[PDB]
Amino acid sequence: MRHRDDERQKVCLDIIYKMMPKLKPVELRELLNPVVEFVSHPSTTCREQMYNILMWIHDNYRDPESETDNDSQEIFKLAKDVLIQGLIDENPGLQLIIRNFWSHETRLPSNTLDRLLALNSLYSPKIEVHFLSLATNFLLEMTSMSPDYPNPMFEHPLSECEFQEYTIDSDWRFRSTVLT
């Protein structure tokens, strides 16, 4: 796998993804230690398989209390870290896949305040330049599921409105005269 070859590493990751559902925690950990090295790989097809492997690991190692053997914990931590790093992937399609994986209702709540609370867990010292943009996107994507979202922001058009004349020469007028 360490050898630089796109097709070879791709079929290696395929073999790993196919043999993963029948591996032991220690074996899975010592086999995932080199798998996470594809986060900085130029090929956009090997990173996809690595992210598939990591999403499978995340979905099949959610249990934090049960199945506690000090190996599943580290595997889950590493998988979560690399999945978080995958939020700034160069490929827009792969980044969209990763953000749709994270934006699911199982991993991020649908309530606004609950999602704001949970977004702090998606932080890592790796994604710091883009953390604010990702958080704002995750917060604003919940607006589409709102009744007022497709409605117009203002009822009447300018064709039937009143032109507001600021006739009151209040303290604002002194500043407007001082300005120009």
Partner 1 sequence: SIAIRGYGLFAGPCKVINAKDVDFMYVELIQRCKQMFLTQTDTGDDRVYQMPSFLQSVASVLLYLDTVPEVYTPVLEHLVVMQIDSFPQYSPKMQLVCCRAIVKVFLALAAKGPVLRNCISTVVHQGLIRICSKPVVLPKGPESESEDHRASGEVRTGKWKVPTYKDYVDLFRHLLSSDQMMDSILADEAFFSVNSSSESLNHLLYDEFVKSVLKIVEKLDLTLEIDPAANLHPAKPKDFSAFINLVEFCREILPEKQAEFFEPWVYSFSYELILQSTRLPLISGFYKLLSITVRNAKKIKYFEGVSDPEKYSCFALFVKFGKEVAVKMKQYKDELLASCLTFLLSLPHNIIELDVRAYVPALQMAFKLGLSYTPLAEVGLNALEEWSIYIDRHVMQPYYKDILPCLDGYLKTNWEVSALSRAAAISLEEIRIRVVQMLGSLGGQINKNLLTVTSSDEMMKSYVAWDREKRLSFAVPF
Partner 2 sequence: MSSFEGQMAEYPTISIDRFDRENLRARAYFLSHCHKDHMKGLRAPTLKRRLECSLKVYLYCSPVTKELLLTSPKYRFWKKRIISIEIETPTQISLVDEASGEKEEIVVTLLPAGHCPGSVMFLFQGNNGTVLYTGDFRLAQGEAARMELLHSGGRVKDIQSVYLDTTFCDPRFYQIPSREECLSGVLELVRSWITRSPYHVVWLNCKAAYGYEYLFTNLSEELGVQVHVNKLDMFRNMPEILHHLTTDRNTQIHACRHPKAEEYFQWSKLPCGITSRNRIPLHIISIKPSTMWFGERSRKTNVIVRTGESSYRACFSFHSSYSEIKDFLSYLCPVNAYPNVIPVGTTMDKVVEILKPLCRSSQSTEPKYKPLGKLKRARTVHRDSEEEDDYLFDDPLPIPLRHKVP
Partner 3 sequence: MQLIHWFTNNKKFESQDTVALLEAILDGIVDPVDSTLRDFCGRCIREFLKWSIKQITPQQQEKSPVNTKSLFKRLYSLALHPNAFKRLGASLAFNNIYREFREEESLVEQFVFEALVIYMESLALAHADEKSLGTIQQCCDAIDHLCRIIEKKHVSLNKAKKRRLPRGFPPSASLCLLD
Residue 45 Cβ vs partner 2, minimum distance, rounded to whole Å:
7
Query: Does the protein bind partner 2 through residue 6 (CB under 8 A)?
Result: yes
Residue 158 Cβ vs partner 3, minimum distance, rounded to whole Å:
6
Query: Does the protein bind partner 2 through residue 37 (CB under 8 A)?
Result: no
Residue 95 contacts which entry, partner 3, partner 2, partner 1, none (Cβ below 5-8 A, type-dependent): none
Query: Does the protein bind partner 1 through residue 154 (CB under 8 A)?
Result: no
Count H helices, E strands: the chain? 8, 0
Query: Does the protein bind partner 3 through residue 166 (CB under 8 A)?
Result: yes
What number of other Cβ atoms are within 10 A of residue 156's Cβ?
A: 9
Q: Which stretch binds partner 2 (CB under 8 A): 7-15, 16-24, 64-72, 154-162?
A: 7-15
Q: Distance (Å, rounded) from C-alpha 79 to C-alpha 85?
A: 10
Choose which of 21, 120, 149, 154 interacts with partner 1 (CB under 8 A): 149
Please check whether residue 86 is in contact with residue 74, taking contact to mean a CB–CB distance below 8 angstroms.
no
Residue 14 Cβ vs partner 2, minimum distance, rounded to whole Å:
13
What type of residue sits at position 157? P
- Cβ neighbors of 57 (< 8 A, separation 6 or more) are 20, 28, 32, 75, 76, 79
Give residue 27's Cα distance to chain centre.
Answer: 28
Q: What residues make contact with partner 2 under the rule CB under 8 A?
A: 4-8, 10, 42-43, 45
